[PDB]
Design a protein around this ligand. Structure first.
Ligand code: A1ATT
Ligand code: CL
Ligand code: CL
Ligand code: CL
Ligand code: CL
Ligand code: NA
Ligand code: NA
Length: 303
């Protein structure tokens, strides 16, 4: 992890970056801020290129579509909690997801959005914004406090609240047993495994493949090729405070063997991987959770 670039929010007493994602445009990074702005920065120079007001509270998460035409944002407490924006021609609002505090695109064909409202998953059509499906079964729920619904790589399956759903049939296929209070789990890009906190399960048999203690209370992301997994531990759950602690870990995504532990000695707000297994960007807070304001920087690392 060679540092390449660092920058703070331009012309700001304290810097308020809260999240990041690589643009479809080379050399440009999208950043959310604590005042609900979306900014485009040159990641090498640190120059601010564009700014748009998206939310009336901190942006917590953002996801660009692969083709560069659409963007999902989420905010902490304002209404709507999540939104879809068009980024061709004039930056515009396409749809609002009033009470969904987390959203993702579908993965294979990016024609749908999946939103989370507490224990409930909502699936929407991008074109119409219509809610197509609600996935929720009170009898199967794990009631994970930090539930996030997600599609699998082929968009055929959803994981919501530790329940595996077949989308087409809107059938609960399997409920994974609950071994933590918070984390609901994600699909491995390999399409064969799910990672639910410290447990790795096989989708073809439902057997436990691996225990990975270091993944406790972690969010994870993969590099472009799905050969490396990055994890960072959430802080246990007024301005937005650092969602993560000060370390992230890398793992071989084929065998879950630890590769590196990186303590950046600053609490982490977000991490994003590029689309070419080359660069990582990290939002790091110079300030503590007791500071009046956050004072974040974006570091670009070569991996
Ligand atoms: C605390 O509430 C406000 C918040 C927040 C928040 N900011 C970034 C993320 C996040 O998960 N980012 C991914 C990457 C991504 N963009 O999905 C991430 C993967 C691995 C890493 F090592 C690192 Cl540091 C971050 C989150 C987040 C937290 C909790 C849950 Cl349940 C869901 C979330 F999206
Ligand atoms: Cl600038
Ligand atoms: Cl806020
Ligand atoms: Cl827990
Ligand atoms: Cl903080
Ligand atoms: Na730089
Ligand atoms: Na705002």
């Amino acid at each position: 992890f060679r540092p390449i670039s660092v920058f703070r929010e331009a012309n700001e007493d304290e810097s308020g970056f809260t999240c990041c994602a690589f643009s479809a445009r080379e050399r440009f990074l999208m950043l959310g801020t604590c005042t609900g702005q979306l900014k485009l920065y040159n990641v090498f120079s640190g120059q601010e290129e564009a700014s748009y007001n998206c939310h009336n509270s901190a942006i917590t998460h953002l996801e660009p579509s692969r083709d560069g035409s659409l963007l999902l944002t989420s905010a902490t407490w304002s209404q709507p909690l999540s939104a879809l924006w068009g980024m061709k021609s004039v930056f515009d609002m396409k749809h609002s997801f009033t009470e969904d505090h987390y959203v993702e695109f579908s993965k294979h064909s990016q024609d749908r959005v999946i939103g989370t409202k507490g224990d409930i998953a909502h699936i929407y059509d991008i074109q119409t914004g219509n809610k197509l499906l609600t996935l929720f079964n009170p009898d199967l729920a794990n009631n994970y406090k930090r539930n996030c619904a997600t599609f699998n790589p082929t968009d055929d399956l959803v994981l919501n609240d530790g329940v595996l759903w077949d989308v087409r049939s809107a059938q609960a296929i399997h409920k994974f047993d609950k071994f933590n209070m918070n984390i609901s789990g994600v699909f491995h890009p390999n399409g064969l495994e799910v990672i639910i906190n410290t447990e790795i399960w096989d989708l073809r048999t439902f057997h436990l493949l691996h225990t990975v203690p270091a993944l406790d209370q972690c969010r994870v992301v993969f590099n472009h090729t799905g050969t490396v997994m990055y994890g960072a531990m959430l802080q246990a759950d007024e301005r937005m405070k650092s969602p993560f602690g000060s370390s992230f870990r890398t793992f071989n995504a084929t065998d879950y063997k630890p590769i590196a532990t990186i303590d950046v000695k600053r609490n982490i707000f977000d991490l994003c991987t590029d689309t070419k297994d080359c660069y990582l960007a990290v939002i790091e807070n110079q300030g503590s959770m007791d500071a009046l304001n956050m004072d974040t920087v974006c570091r670009l690392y070569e991996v």
